Design a binder for this molecule. Structure first.
Ligand SMILES: Nc1ncnc2c1ncn2[C@@H]1O[C@H](CSCC[C@H](N)C(=O)O)[C@@H](O)[C@H]1O
Ligand SMILES: Nc1ncnc2c1ncn2[C@@H]1O[C@H](CSCC[C@H](N)C(=O)O)[C@@H](O)[C@H]1O
Lengths: 226, 228
């Protein structure tokens, strides 16, 4: 359901952009706006969407609670990542929004999302723009994504069981870390690079709740070896 | 071809919208901009204007009537959030993309957009062979001009792009499952002569992830550190 689909805006800084994003959302029937650390402070027509915008300081807080995280980027600035086109994105998002919150993440005008931020997404979506001019304006990008989302949703209004939330996955990663510290595989005050490798892997696998359960079972059993 | 797709703006009232529309075009590979009686004068040489937008505006055709904008086009499609007064046939934006690209292969095509606030008159919509409504929120169904152009141009580019493998490491993945089973046996998480259920769940999990050899090396390293 459309109310479960979050438009997440990271550190947006041009005050007109927020209004444009809000109008785009509303026209597509989206309403659930999240602002990660806005450099401009909350003048348009879709006032409601912005008045009811969640604000948070960090990206993690916009993501915890979602089962599906999708980041947007014109080009890759990470190792190979699972990719969706905007159509596929719309389908997958509408499919999961029935039960759980979905985060569609958008970066800053001019500089976009960082590598670090992009690594907290389960999928990357690149709109297939003209290669010489492949960056759309933030609000435009939202328009495209939201339009595909509405297509998919409309299709469902044409007459399974949830995924773990980012929260659960994070608990599993904590458990994984402590296990690796225990066995000595990673060191005290590790820079988090091995953990990032493993997160890349499991993000691509995208564990279901029972799979996650089994994994933590295994971790638990290992720790009783010491 | 994309240069044969005419974006036609009738009587644009805010500049800023002209820049935005120009940028939407450029990012989707469109360049053929037509202005019918702009109620504004597009600057072009502004530094504020994005990349590619300036050239699209500078090379725009400026005419006095819609008919000139439609001259030489076999296919004319107009846009409107809703047009119940008229019995004109509808396309959704996807169909419009397809139909436009097929035609633009050989003949100019016009995609027409209206004034902000009031859109196109019914006389002007009557000059279009088809109408496209972007399916929207029934309560809030009018897109911003530039956003409507963006959507239509996106579907056009998708339609145009349309006109332009076994997992290699199965053996290694197997070796990994073998060692994984030995580890699970050694920690007691599975028992001798297990019916292979936990293992199967694990294999579904890891196999759909299509592990890279790097990742298999890390996983193996972890298994090895456990025994220690
Ligand atoms: N071609 C494209 N595909 C997917 N998202 C895009 C996009 N162009 C712009 N966006 C969205 O709009 C925001 C501002 S564009 C920022 C610069 C850079 N082109 C980038 O996307 O990474 C981006 O962070 C992204 O969320
Ligand atoms: N949902 C939608 N479908 C098709 N075109 C739209 C649209 N929303 C806005 N537009 C375009 O943007 C222009 C200005 S918006 C003006 C709103 C007007 N009520 C109308 O749609 O006709 C319109 O002329 C139209 O070309």
């Amino acid at each position: 359901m459309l109310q479960n689909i979050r438009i997440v805006l990271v550190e947006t800084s041009h005050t007109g952009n927020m209004g444009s994003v809000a109008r785009a959302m509303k026209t597509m029937g989206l309403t659930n706006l999240w602002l990660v650390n806005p450099l401009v402070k909350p003048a348009a027509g879709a006032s409601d969407v912005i008045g009811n915008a969640h604000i948070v300081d960090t990206l993690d807080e916009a993501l915890a609670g979602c089962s599906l995280v999708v980041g947007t980027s014109a080009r890759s600035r990470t190792l190979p990542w699972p990719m969706l086109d905007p159509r596929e994105c719309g389908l997958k998002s509408v499919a999961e929004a029935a039960n759980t919150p979905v985060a569609l993440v958008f970066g800053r005008e001019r500089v976009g999302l960082t590598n670090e931020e992009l690594q907290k997404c389960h999928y990357h979506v690149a709109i297939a723009a003209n290669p010489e001019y492949s960056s759309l304006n933030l609000a435009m990008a939202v328009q495209v994504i939201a339009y595909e989302v509405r297509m998919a949703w409309l299709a469902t209004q044409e007459n399974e069981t949830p995924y773990p939330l980012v929260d659960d996955l994070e608990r599993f990663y904590g458990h994984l870390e402590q296990t690796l510290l225990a066995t000595g595989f990673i060191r005290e005050n590790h820079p988090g690079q091995v953990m990032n490798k493993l997160r890349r892997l499991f993000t691509r696998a995208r564990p279901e709740s029972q799979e996650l359960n089994i994994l933590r079972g295994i971790l638990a059993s290992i720790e009783q070896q010491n």
